[PDB]
Symmetry: C3
Subunit: 310 residues, 3 copies
Amino acid sequence: PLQEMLAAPSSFKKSHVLSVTQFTRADLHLLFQIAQEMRLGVQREGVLDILRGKVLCTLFYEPSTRTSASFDAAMQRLGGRTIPIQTSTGETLQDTLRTLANYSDAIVLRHPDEKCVDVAKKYCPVPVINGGNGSKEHPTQAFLDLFTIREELGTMQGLTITFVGDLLYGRPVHSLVYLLRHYQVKVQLVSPKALRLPPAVRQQLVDAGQLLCESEALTPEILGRTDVLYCTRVQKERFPSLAEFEAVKDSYRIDYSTLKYAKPTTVVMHPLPRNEEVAEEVDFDQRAAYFRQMRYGLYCRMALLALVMS
Amino acid sequence: PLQEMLAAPSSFKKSHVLSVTQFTRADLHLLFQIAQEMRLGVQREGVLDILRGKVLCTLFYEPSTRTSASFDAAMQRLGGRTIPIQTSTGETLQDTLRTLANYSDAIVLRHPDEKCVDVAKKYCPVPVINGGNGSKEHPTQAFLDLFTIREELGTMQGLTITFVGDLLYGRPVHSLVYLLRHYQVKVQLVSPKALRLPPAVRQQLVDAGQLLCESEALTPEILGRTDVLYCTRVQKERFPSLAEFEAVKDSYRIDYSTLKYAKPTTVVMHPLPRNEEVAEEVDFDQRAAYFRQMRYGLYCRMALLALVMS
Amino acid sequence: PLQEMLAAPSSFKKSHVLSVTQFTRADLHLLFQIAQEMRLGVQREGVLDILRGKVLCTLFYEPSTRTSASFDAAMQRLGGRTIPIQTSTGETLQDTLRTLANYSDAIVLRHPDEKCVDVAKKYCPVPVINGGNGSKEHPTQAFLDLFTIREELGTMQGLTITFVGDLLYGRPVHSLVYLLRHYQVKVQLVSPKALRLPPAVRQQLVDAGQLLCESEALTPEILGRTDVLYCTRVQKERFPSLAEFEAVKDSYRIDYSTLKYAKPTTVVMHPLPRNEEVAEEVDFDQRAAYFRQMRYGLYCRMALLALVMS
C-alpha cells in the first residue's frame, strides 16, 4: 500500500528538489498521500525499511536545527543512514558538493547564497534537496505548511488564510501563495505598507481570484473570518524608526486578547523561529499548531526522501 | 533474562530522569542488574536489539564529549538511532525542546541554566534525561559512580569513602552522598575549610551515621583506611590567593608518594575532567579506576535508556 | 569471496594504522583486492553487513570534511555505527582517547600535533587510524592515491609520474614515493628550487632507480611524457616575495593550455583542497580524476576498516 504508492510515477524520483515551481498539484497530492502512510508506519514500528542501503548527507552552512534534525530523523526513520555536516563559507561549494556526492546518495543543502541551487544543478551528480538558499526558497517548508492546513482543517475549499507581519521578506508566504494557486481560498494580508507582498506575488493572488483584503491593522473583523492565521517574524531591522517597529509588534502580537476575536477553529501557524509575535501564553491552546507543523514536516520529508531515493 | 528484567516495573519507564531524588534503592538495584546484563550482551554481539525503532536526540548547549558520546554510544549499542545536536544559548530552550520532541522519543539535555529541568518538565512532551543542569545535578554520573564502587569492591557494607578536594562546588559528591544514604559506609572529607560540604549535605551524613572524619589534610592515616578515594577538581578561581591554591594542590595530588600510604585495594575515582590532582604516573596503576568509570557509565546508560524507552 | 578475503591474514587486523612504513607490498595488494570487492557490494546493496555490531568514533581536532565524512560513510556502509566528534586543542588528548576507547571499537584521529600518533600508541587501548598528524602523514590518503593510479591506468610498470608544485611541504607526495618504492616507474619533479623534495626523499627515488627529471618549469616535454600529473597546493606563505609566488602559480596552473601538451590518457590528481592550481574549466575533462579519487578513497577505507575491525 506504501510500497504501492512508492511504485507510482513522480517528478520527485531521482530529482533535485530546489523550487516549488517544479511540482504540480498531483505531485503534492501524491506526496501528501505517502506522508499519511509514513505517519502510520512510524506510529507502529518507529524505524521503517524503505531506505536501508541509502545514505543521506546534510550540508548546512548556517545552522537550522529544526530543518537539519528534521531531515536527519526522517532519513533514519526510513531506515537509511545519515552523515550530518556542519561548515561555514577556504573550499568552494561546488568542490564540497562533488566531494560529498561520492559518499552519499543525496544531499540536503542549506547555504547563504541563493545561487547555491544553480551551483548544485551545474556540478553535483546526486539529487540535492534545497534546505534554504539565501532565504529565497525553502520548498519542503512550503510543502509541510500546505500539508499542515489540509491536515488540521480538511478541505481547502472555503478557507480564508490571513498572512500577518512582514510579507515582503517573508518568503515562506510567497512559496505558499504559489502552492495555493490550485485552491479556492481567500487571502487576507496584514502588514505595514512598507512590507506588503512583492507586486508580482500580490498579482499572483488577484490572478487566481483570491485576494480578499489588504490591511495595515489586525482587526477583529479580519480575525473573525480567519480559518488560518499564518504569522511571520517581524525583525527590528525592517524598520528605520524603533517606535514604528514596536507599534507594529504590539498590533500584530497573537495573544489571548487577539485570539478571542478569532474562530474556535482558527489554526495559528508560524514557520519559526519566533520572537514575541506569538505569546507563550498561547502555546497550549488547541489552535496553536506551530509545533504540530514540525511533526507534519517529519512525515512530509520522509515521503519526499522515499520518493527522491526510490 | 534481559527481556525479563526489562519486563519488570520501574520508576524509569516513560519518566524524566532529572534528579537522584526521584529514585529508590530498588530503582537503582534493578538498573545495576540490567547494566550487568547490558555488559554481557555487548561483550558477545556489540550492537543489541532492545531499541530498534527508537530515536534519541542529544541536545548539548555546552560540550561534554564524555557524556554526549557516552549516550550516543549507549543508544546505538541498544540498536536505536541517535540525532546529536550541538548549540549554544536566539531561540528559547522550550521552543527547541518542543521542536525536537517531534523527531525523537527522548532527549538528553545539558544546559548551563539549572532551571532547565523545570523548563523541560513544563514543556517537553517526551522523556528528558538530565545530562547536567548548570552543574547542580548530573544523575547518571551519580549512578555510574555508585555502580563503579559496587563493581570494583563488591558489597558496600564496611567501606570507607574519602572525598578529596573541592567539596562545596563538587556536586557529584553531593549526589553520591544522597545515593549512599542506604548503605553502612563511613565517609571522610578532605578539603580546605573554605570548601567543606554545604551544611545540609554534611547533615545528611551525620543523620545516616556515616561522618567519620573531616580534615584539611590528606594524611597517611586517612589514606590508610580509604577503600575509595574520590577526587574532585580544585580550580584556581575557588581561592583568592594563588599561594593557598597551590598549597592545596600539592597537598591533595594523588601521585605515587600518596598512593604508597593507601591500601592495595583502594579504588581511585574522579568524575573528570582532571587538572593535575591525579598524576599521569598513576594512570596505569590497577587502582586507577577513572577510565573504567566510563565503561561502567556506558553499561548504566544503556540500562537507563532501555528502561526509560521500554 | 569477500568473507574469504577478510578471512585472510593481514598486518591490518587489530592494528593501529599510523604510518605507510607499517605495511608491505602484499598488505596493500590485499587491501586493494578487498576495496574492489567493497565497490561491488556497495554497487548492489548500498549498506553491507561486514561490521554490524562495531562502533567507530571519529575524533577530529581540525575539520577535514573530505576525510571525516569519508570514514563516516565507510563505516556506515559496512553496516557499523559511527560517533563523530568535533573538538579543538582543557582536556588532554590521552584522556580523550582513553575516554572514547570505552565507547567504540576504534578511533580515527586527526590532530595538529605530529606526536599524536605516539600518544595514541602509548595510551589508547583500541586501534587508532591516523587521519592526519600535524600534516606529517596521512596514510589512507597515500593508499587511496596509489589505488587511484592503479585503477585509472592498469599496471604500474612503464608509468611516468610527475609531481608538481610544493614538494617540500607536500607530504602526500613523500608518502606516495614511499608506496611507489615497489614499482618500475619514473618520476619527474617540478617545483621551485626553494621547494624541492627533502634530500632523503629524493634519495629514496634515486635509490629505487626512478628519478627521471627535476625541473623548475612545467614544460611541454615534461607534460608530453606524463602518465600521472599529481598536483599539490602552493600556498603564498611558502614564498617571501609575492611576485615569485604568482610567477609560480601561473607557471604550474593546470588549465586547457596546459593539458593540450599532455597525453590523452594523463590522469590529473590532487589531494585537495585546491586553490587555483587546477582550473575549474578542467573539472569535466575525462582526465580530471580528483573527484574520482574520493570515491576510490571510500572503497579503500571500507576495506581498511573491515580489515582492522575484522
